Amino acid sequence: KEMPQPKTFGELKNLPLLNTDKPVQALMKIADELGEIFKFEAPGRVTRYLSSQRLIKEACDESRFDKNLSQALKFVRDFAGDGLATSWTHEKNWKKAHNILLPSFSQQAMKGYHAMMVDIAVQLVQKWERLNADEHIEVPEDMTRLTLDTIGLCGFNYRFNSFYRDQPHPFITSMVRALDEAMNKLQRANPDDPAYDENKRQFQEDIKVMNDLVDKIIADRKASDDLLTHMLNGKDPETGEPLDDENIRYQIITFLIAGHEATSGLLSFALYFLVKNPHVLQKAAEEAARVLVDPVPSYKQVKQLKYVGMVLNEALRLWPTAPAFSLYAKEDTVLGGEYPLEKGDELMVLIPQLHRDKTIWGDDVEEFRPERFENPSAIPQHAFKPFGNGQRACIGQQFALHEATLVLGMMLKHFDFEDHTNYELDIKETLTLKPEGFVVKAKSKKIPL
């Protein structure tokens, strides 16, 4: 079979299609036009975009395909280096850090983070309780305050104190700037052109901001049993080695970025979907009131918020906040019985499209219906992949979900929410997705913390 490909622009091939602020959403539209697979060419470059569970289940076979660093991740590697998310599977430092850091996400570790998560969640609830009449909430802004502070405190015993600031923590400003530059490089025809000299300067200036904080965090610890403890002291069972200093710095950067951005997106989409679906919101609120009987939630109570977990999964179905991942063929292989691939050939999994596979989910795929997840085991293998695949899946998945469940439960216990502007969904794309400009009003239910 000869594979579909979107419209081309002479020698630029398909490249100009990605000259947009919303590339994933563009690609989703192309996926709608062309189906389960399409070829995407740029000068000197080719990838194939996959949207169907039928094809993605083969792509997820680790014997045939391994994680690739997309062009995005390759640019992120300029500051994240050989940290876990931007390492190749065959780099010694991937498997070492993987073995060393996985215990930071054990059941006992998670129970250990719970009190610190509550610290930040209480800060968020207090902020909202303290608003005056008619004042409104900037949802993604506040969710980022929460998620950054949570990873900072839980992972590193470091307090970004984001609820003490009216604008983002400097770290975030540079992170966003650096990630935007990393994206802008995709289009650039002549990267070494003096025209971009200033962009390299601001890039390195933003990386420098990020690295200064990393030094602060490591300094402060020199003067806990968290992530950082494991980075500094943990030994890999296989090699018997610990991480070296250079790799440790990369992990810190990696975890500070990965550990907050997608989770803030998730919480924001979840609240967006709730205020757009009032019956669902009522059911979630009812669970929160029924389960969260104490002034502050326990770890076990969070685990009992079944419906809230369903709501979070349905939000990840529709808008998985890290919306793509890239694979390469380990050897020559045939995809789907129809698409021959050679060793090294690249694939991109367009996760929001996978999650709209009508053969898997039914015809109603645009509807927000958390009951799809009544029994998560009912979902076929490789049909729901918001956390990636296999040994290269999200290490922090349970952390994200615990924090998100705890926080949304508390939000639903303590406040009624109003979509006072009838917000029109506008999805901004950076490393991740978020509903830009999303605002609500919260009316306190006046329940003490």
The strand pair at 45-50 and 65-68 is best described as unpaired
Tokens representing 140 are: 């993604």
Residue 353 main-chain phi, psi, to 5 deg: -75, -40
Site for ligand HEM in 37-66 (CB under 6 A): none
154 is in an annotated binding site: no
For residues 94, 95, 101, 103, the Cα torsion angle rounded to the nearest 10 degrees is 160
Site for ligand HEM in 308-367 (CB under 6 A): 320-322, 325
Considering the rule CB under 6 A, would residue 74 count as an interface residue with ligand HEM? no
Site for ligand HEM in 16-35 (CB under 6 A): none
Residue 219: enclosing H or E segment and its boundaries?
helix 197-222
In sequence order, the 6+-apart residues with CB closer than 8 A to the CB of 410 are 121, 124, 125, 288, 292, 297
Report helix, strand or coil for 306. helix
Least separation in angstroms between residue 257's CB and ligand HEM is 9
Least separation in angstroms between residue 199's CB and ligand HEM is 25
What single-letter DSSP state applies at residue 391? G
Choice from 140, 234, 259, 352 touching ligand HEM (CB under 6 A): 259
158 is in an annotated binding site: no
Residue 399 or 438: the one with the smaller Cβ distance to ligand HEM is 399
Site for ligand HEM in 166-225 (CB under 6 A): none
Which of 196-204, 372-380, 395-403, 416-424 is the region at the interface with ligand HEM (rule: CB under 6 A)?
Answer: 395-403
Which of 45-53, 162-170, 259-267, 272-280 is the region at the interface with ligand HEM (rule: CB under 6 A)?
Answer: 259-267
Considering the rule CB under 6 A, would residue 400 count as an interface residue with ligand HEM? yes
Integer Rg of the chain from CA? 22
Which H, E and C letters describe 254-274, residue by residue?
Answer: HHHHHCCHHHHHHHHHHHHHH
How many of the chain's residues bind ligand HEM (CB under 6 A)?
A: 25
Choice from 396, 405, 411, 414 touching ligand HEM (CB under 6 A): 396
Least separation in angstroms between residue 97's CB and ligand HEM is 7
Report helix, strand or coil for 100. helix
Its sign, for the CA torsion 52, 384, 394, 214, is positive
What angle in degrees, to the nearest 10, is found between the helix axes of 261-276 and 245-258? 10
Distance CA 432, CA 403 (A): 18
Least separation in angstroms between residue 110's CB and ligand HEM is 11
The one-letter code for the residue type at 408 is L
Which of 115-123, 270-278, 331-339, 384-392 is the region at the interface with ligand HEM (rule: CB under 6 A)?
Answer: 384-392
Q: 177-189 in b/e burial notation, b at 16+ Cβ within 10 A?
A: bbbbbbbebbeee
Query: Which single residue brings its beta carbon nearest to ligand HEM?
Result: 396
Considering the rule CB under 6 A, would residue 384 count as an interface residue with ligand HEM? no
- Contact footprint for ligand HEM (CB under 6 A): 67, 84-85, 98, 151, 254-255, 258-259, 262-263, 266, 320-322, 325, 386-388, 392, 394-396, 399-400
Please report, in range form, the residues annotated as the binding site.
49, 394
